[PDB]
Amino acid sequence: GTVTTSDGTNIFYKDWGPRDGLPVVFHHGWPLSADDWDNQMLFFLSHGYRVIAHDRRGHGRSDQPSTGHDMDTYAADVAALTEALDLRGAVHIGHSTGGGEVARYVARAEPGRVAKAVLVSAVPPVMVKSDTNPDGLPLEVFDEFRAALAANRAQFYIDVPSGPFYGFNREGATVSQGLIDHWWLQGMMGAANAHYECIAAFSETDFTDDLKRIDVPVLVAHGTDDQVVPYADAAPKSAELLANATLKSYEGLPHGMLSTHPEVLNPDLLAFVKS
Amino acid sequence: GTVTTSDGTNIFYKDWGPRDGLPVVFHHGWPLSADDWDNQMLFFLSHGYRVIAHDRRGHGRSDQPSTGHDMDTYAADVAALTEALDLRGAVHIGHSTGGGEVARYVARAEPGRVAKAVLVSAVPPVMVKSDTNPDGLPLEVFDEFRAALAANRAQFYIDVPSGPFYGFNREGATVSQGLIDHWWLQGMMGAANAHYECIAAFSETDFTDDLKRIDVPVLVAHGTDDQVVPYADAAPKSAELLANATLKSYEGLPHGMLSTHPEVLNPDLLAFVKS
Amino acid sequence: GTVTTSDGTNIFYKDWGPRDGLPVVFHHGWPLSADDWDNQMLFFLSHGYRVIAHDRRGHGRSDQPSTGHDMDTYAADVAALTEALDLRGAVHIGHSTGGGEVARYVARAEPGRVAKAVLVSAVPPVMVKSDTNPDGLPLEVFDEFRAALAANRAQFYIDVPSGPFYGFNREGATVSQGLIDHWWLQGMMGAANAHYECIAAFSETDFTDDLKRIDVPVLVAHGTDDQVVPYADAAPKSAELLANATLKSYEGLPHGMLSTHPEVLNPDLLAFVKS
Known part of the structure; x- marks a missing residue:
């Protein structure tokens, strides 16, 4: 489907699974698209969830606007x-x-x-x-x-x-x-x-204030050999700032461990969603 | 262009050639798109036919709906x-x-x-x-x-x-x-x-009943070294169930023979369309 | 963005940069798309220009009509x-x-x-x-x-x-x-x-009469080892036919020089646009 935002940008999204299912919404990284989640979407679909993923503005099938990045x-x-x-x-x-x-x-x-x-x-x-x-x-x-x-x-x-x-x-x-x-x-x-x-x-965006306001439970997962987003300056710090956070560290895994090691991560994600 | 189906799914299609030419419509296999027919679309166009090919729902440029697969x-x-x-x-x-x-x-x-x-x-x-x-x-x-x-x-x-x-x-x-x-x-x-x-x-779909219902002439073509859809369980059985079928066997050709051996297949498709 | 032409063909285009920026419009070659200009679009955007580039009909994200080629x-x-x-x-x-x-x-x-x-x-x-x-x-x-x-x-x-x-x-x-x-x-x-x-x-199109009618300043840039559009039959001849042309030859550069040597061509494009 597509959603038109307030400045007129069309955003592309996928929405699969039971209309009555619990919604699991996936947010891709840079510089990718909702298609980076194929593995997890099929996985969660197979467990009965409703799975939704959009293409960020300027990414994938979404429009390519001049502003709003x-x-x-x-x-x-x-x-x-x-x-x-x-x-x-x-x-x-x-x-x-x-x-x-x-x-x-x-x-x-x-x-x-x-x-x-x-x-x-x-x-x-x-x-x-x-x-x-x-x-x-x-x-x-x-x-x-x-x-x-x-x-x-x-x-x-x-x-x-x-x-x-x-x-x-x-x-x-x-x-x-x-x-x-x-x-x-x-x-x-x-x-x-x-x-x-x-x-x-x-x-360069500081999310410290955002994390301070989150009150729902948050799973913070990160691989320790992440060459793109250094583990020590991210995961542990975010966990410390969140009120209800669970921190899981995966030894030796990379930045794109959702695709290289889904058999390690997927069960931990489903457990958390079910808790 | 696109056509909207009864459930609101948009289907992408191509429509090239004379508006009054005899229409030849191409149906791609899994998991491809209407772009798999490039060669045959140009070949038929050169013989004056109108050539149409759509992307199956959830394929190519068509929508990716939750259901109807x-x-x-x-x-x-x-x-x-x-x-x-x-x-x-x-x-x-x-x-x-x-x-x-x-x-x-x-x-x-x-x-x-x-x-x-x-x-x-x-x-x-x-x-x-x-x-x-x-x-x-x-x-x-x-x-x-x-x-x-x-x-x-x-x-x-x-x-x-x-x-x-x-x-x-x-x-x-x-x-x-x-x-x-x-x-x-x-x-x-x-x-x-x-x-x-x-x-x-x-x-798993059984097409036996559909095949018994077809009355127009049907050309059944198949490569004998097909490693995806085994030759002996498909082509000769289809031809025996169809009222007016012609069976063409291509020694040693593969599943994707329309792309690896178009110079052999195209003239035979053409002969059938002209007959 | 998309614009529909008078035969109903949709053309995709990109339009980035300041709304009051001088418009620099890019026309890609065969058989490519607006995306062939990524380097030059980011370069001119960094100098404050508005940059625009469309997909020619039958190319990239534009429709694929029967005619009009x-x-x-x-x-x-x-x-x-x-x-x-x-x-x-x-x-x-x-x-x-x-x-x-x-x-x-x-x-x-x-x-x-x-x-x-x-x-x-x-x-x-x-x-x-x-x-x-x-x-x-x-x-x-x-x-x-x-x-x-x-x-x-x-x-x-x-x-x-x-x-x-x-x-x-x-x-x-x-x-x-x-x-x-x-x-x-x-x-x-x-x-x-x-x-x-x-x-x-x-x-096969002869653009001789087109060139004789252009009276704005025109920069004619061409690589001398162009293996797709031979230099001698193009750039010098175009430059003689234009009223106000500047010819720039790039010794030994290929047909795809905007992408292989942007550090050489971008400065020259910018100096022409500022002149």
Whole structure:
């Protein structure tokens, strides 16, 4: 389906499963699309849930607008979607950049919209190194990403999934060429301007205040060998700021562990959704 | 263009060639799209035919609805398109799973809408082993496709076209990386739930009754080294059940022979459409 | 965004940047899409311009109509778009086949619509060999393209970008696998019939009279080792026929130079637009 937001942007979404099922809403990372969740959507569908996933503005099949590439607009786009579908008691699961979108939307959501949230390999509290965050990554790492994306996006999108994203640069790791090709295809369908601008939106936005307002139970899951969103500056810190958080650490797993190790993660997600 | 079906699903279709030419409609297999017919669409166009091809629901550029992944809905979606275009005297060509859709649509079509039909490498009568079909394939063959698709669809869709679909695993075959990569792209564009559910629809639906209902002339074509839809349980059985069928056997050709050997097949399809 | 033309064809386009920015409109080459301009769009956006690029009919995300695959229609589709956006004083940049479409559009544009144009590695004045153009390429070259495209588009779309398009067949060239894969993707998304018919459109159309009617400043840029649109029969001839043209030759650069050497071409495009 599609949902039109307040500035006229059409957002594409998938909505599968029982109309009466408990809604599980998935928020993809950068620079991907709702199709990055195939495995988890089939999994949750098989357990009877209703599964919903949208393409962020400028990504996948959604429109490619000139503006709105920032976390507040992203969270507002989610609210347009959940209001259009009139979702109640949904579970929101966000990966990477999508975990920041989830944190901001759940902090601002209308009552009864959300029951639980899951932040997987997520960006909060804040990634960039600063006064307030001495353990963050320097701005130069993100300048690098911006410069390579602008210069030859198609090559940059082979390098990322080939190296750090799924940990395929680690000696002995089982490599899947299909995961590399699929990441590149999802990224090439989206907009160069949205992908370029989103880098600053995921790495420089402070979600500390958002996390402080979340009162529903939150599962915080992260792999310890994450080469994209450093584990120590994210997971433990987010868990400490949330009122009702469960922290799960997966030794040796990468940033895209939902696709490389779904047999480890999926049972832990279903347990939490059922608790 | 697109056509809206009774449940509100939008179906993408192509319609090229003279508006008054005889219509030849192409039905793609699993898990592809209308783009699998490029070669045959240009070949028929060059002989002055009007050439139509749609993306099955949940495939290519069509919508990805929650339900309707079954042969009865697929044939009703075909009727929705042929009614919107008001086709008369059309020739329907179906490959693989599209051959099952053709058999069911043609058996139920309003009289005058169809002139002739062609089943290439098609699934009928019935693939799976049952009480009525002991030479069929065991269910476990299909349970493996389901499990590989659900675990890592992007890698499973490299594995199928690299191996059995086009016979590139046979010694001495001509391998085209282009055919592999195009199969993968068309597959990854479609929906994971549609592709998953379709496996039961193409392999367990019994088309025996549809086949007994068809009265127009039917060309049944099939490669004898078909590693996806086994030759002996399909083509000769279909031809024996159809009132007016012509059986064409192609020694040593694979399941995707319309793309690996179009120079052999195209003239034979053409002869049939002109007869 | 999308605009519907007067024959009902939908054309997709992107429009990014300030609303009061001078409009720089990009016209991609054969058989590509608006996405071929990612580098140049982010570059001009970073200098405060509004940047616009559409998918030619039968290409990329635009519809795939039966007809209209000719330069007169391509220039009327551009007129339809610039009227809908109400562009005034735009700069039109065209690559390859897109440079012929820019010449035709600019020659017929309404008063006030165009300020300047840029023809990069463009097809004017006329490619095909004849009595009028003794240095053209023989019709046989384009007949081979037609034949390879119709036989196996998927494989021909790997061969073109792998050999001649980007000069990767030259000893010592730095090959980018992402450039190859992206060319192929953009090509496979477009229509086989449009791509096939466009070959005659770009190689056989004589743009001599179009060039003689253009009176705005025109930059004619061309690589001297262009293996798709030979330099000697294009750039110098176009520059002689234009009233106010600046010719820039790039020694040893390929047809795809905007993507292989953007650090060389982008400065020159910007200096032309600021002049």
